[PDB]
Design an enzyme around this catalytic site. Structure first.
Site, PDB file in Angstrom:
ATOM      1  CB  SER C 141      -0.923   0.013   1.221  1.00  0.00           C
ATOM      2  OG  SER C 141      -1.842   1.087   1.135  1.00  0.00           O
ATOM      3  CE1 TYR C 147       2.816   3.528   5.064  1.00  0.00           C
ATOM      4  CE2 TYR C 147       4.107   4.412   3.234  1.00  0.00           C
ATOM      5  CZ  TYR C 147       3.047   3.649   3.699  1.00  0.00           C
ATOM      6  OH  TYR C 147       2.220   3.006   2.803  1.00  0.00           O
TER       7      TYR C 147
END
Lengths: 213, 228, 232, 220
Positions: C141, C147
């Site tokens: 994703s 992140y």
């Protein structure tokens, strides 16, 4: 830093800066371009800014004239010895089909001719260093840009086992110092020329701070 | 309603496979290749193998003649309607290197540019279309330069055509099991290579994806290659 | 070749829920993994209503961060139902830890997304290694790098198993889509219209295409982009 | 004026060679690693190897202990001032599940901790340069990529803040960390040192995300 240094696009900007940079470093530079007006200008400066320099070799030429360009270089090889460096710093030249063919010829075919000539010489030498200065319409510009990269890529792999190194420098904008300075490309080359003899760097990508975000 | 699907290199190998497949799927395939004779054979094979299929259009043509290619294709478009697909499956072509390098650029890159320009002109007007590219050793850099030039062309069009409603996907397979593979220098057994139908079914899957999904490229690799 | 078990993580919602549904319709006996027993059961019941004759979905209430409990349950199902043909890692990305120290949030984020994923992978790959067959699908994703690091760690894992497993008859493919049109996109407050995004079926249909490729065809990854994102 | 240059994995190998190099260049280098005595060695060599040099700060520290690391780095910053460079040259530390968890902690969680501390400082200075030196089940591959995703993430996150990042990806380098095949003609640590030298001297607006060094040999 003792042999010859062939440099295309030597009469202007980046090519000129690197020409004057390697001349100071000791190499005997071969200034390739057209203007036996603009080249000499680089000639005079170089040697008017150095205590001692091997003196530049002004070779007015249209590298797009493949056969002639190859003759001129070989002649230069006969007279002045070995070629240690080749810096492709010529600026890129950006009915439809006809134009694309013309852009491929001037930007890729001509370049291939020069590499072809200079590579034969270096292989006999089992040594040498090739430097490519890149940049970064229905795909005209892209196809041309990658054509040069794929060419560099191929030479890199097949010339390495023969002692010849190839490195392509890919900077964004360069000439306002919000861009990559010409001295940055020159100094990166000096660094490259000084690495261990067995170290090979395919390419280096230069990005402007402003461009990142 | 399924319109035209133009396939280059349609007389042999991968091209002939994809062409026969899209014809079976319902498109009116336009078979492009140099030999009128060998094209008529793919055409014959299709009619014979299909109960109901729009008769393939046999277009003997040397894509190198971009002027003739543009006229012919635009004539076909005027006569038969919408062009839904372009499949570039022409085989990769490979006394003096510099001139030899030119002929290689002309045949593999300049010519595809011509076909692409013609077809995209048609697709831009329709605001619809799908372009598939089928891609596939020292030599002073000739082979790689040529290959990269096609990808650079592909990359640019992918970006440029996206908003216009035209999609582009380059398929990069290793050795593919076709007659062209055996005649080439394939050291692998049939089974060990990527199969022709794998490419056709991948194209079928791409054609069925929702309209807004874009996939720039799909790299196909042989288990054997990874092992070795 | 009879269709065996298909294990799907993050099967109670989003992309996982849709792929699980499609694989059940294709003939596989699906194993639905997620924490909500309730929501897994709704997926189980929806599939049976869509087609009563499909192999019955196995509901597996699990927190995949409990690597030991996951291994135990999965292996029991393999002993019970046979060959495991497919593993789809579609569990959403846990991207945020409400804690004081970020270095600790980074630990928890890495634990929940990478270590956990590794666990599931380890269990299923040793099953598939014995079988000398199987197909693994992964649905990808100012963070300070948290992140990006977690994302690559997953890609790094996939890339090595791709090369590692290929010679064992096991294939690996990572799907990397932009925004996908599901309820989770709504939960994440997508600014796009439903049709503007990548549809769930595209991932499902691509998985179906991969499963039908010839056995020796390997495709490491497929990147899905939204026309709009490019248009922007 | 040249400030602090923090180097992890400074007691041996590449970090060692880079530390002494930057010391000779003018920076006051902080030597980080576990072995106090070994950090001392580097310290004294640097000392006797240069006529004049800012004296290297020896920092016996297991960066695995995040909180302690952050504290120790803050003191040196408090006491000595600005941080110009941060070179992560620490080596790659390599139920399998718990083992993977440990490898991540030591290699990625720990590094993140160091970066966090140093980044905070460079943030305020609006200046600084960070240099990174890069049947398993995917552990090594995962860890390696994790570190890369982090560096890539910070690369564009710190660029607009006047802080640069570059990852040096070498092949075999000739350092005695030669537990494990080539004949001393691998990448020399000096090549990495000199590359960093070059990067430090480029225009402040030029950004290079990474540089891949290969062995003329490795390209068969």
């Amino acid at each position: 830093q003792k042999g010859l240094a062939i440099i295309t696009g030597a009469s202007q900007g980046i090519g000129a800066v690197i020409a004057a940079g390697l001349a100071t470093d000791g190499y005997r530079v071969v200034l390739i371009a057209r203007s036996k007006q603009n080249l000499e200008k680089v000639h005079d400066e170089i040697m008017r800014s150095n205590k001692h320099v091997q003196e530049p070799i002004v070779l007015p030429l249209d590298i797009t004239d493949c056969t002639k360009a190859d003759t001129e270089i070989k002649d230069i090889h006969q007279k002045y010895g070995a070629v240690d460096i080749l810096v492709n710093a010529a600026a890129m030249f950006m009915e439809p089909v006809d134009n694309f063919r013309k852009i491929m010829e001037i930007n890729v075919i001509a370049q291939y001719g020069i590499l072809k000539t200079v590579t034969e010489i270096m292989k006999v030498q089992k040594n040498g260093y090739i430097f490519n200065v890149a940049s970064r319409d229905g795909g005209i510009y892209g196809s041309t840009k990658f054509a040069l990269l794929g060419l560099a890529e191929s030479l890199y792999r097949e010339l390495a086992p023969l002692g010849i190194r190839v490195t392509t420098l890919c900077p964004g904008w360069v000439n306002d110092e919000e861009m990559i300075q010409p001295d940055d490309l020159l100094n990166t080359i000096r660094c490259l020329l000084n690495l261990s003899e067995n170290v090979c760097i395919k390419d280096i990508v230069f990005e402007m701070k402003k461009s990142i975000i």
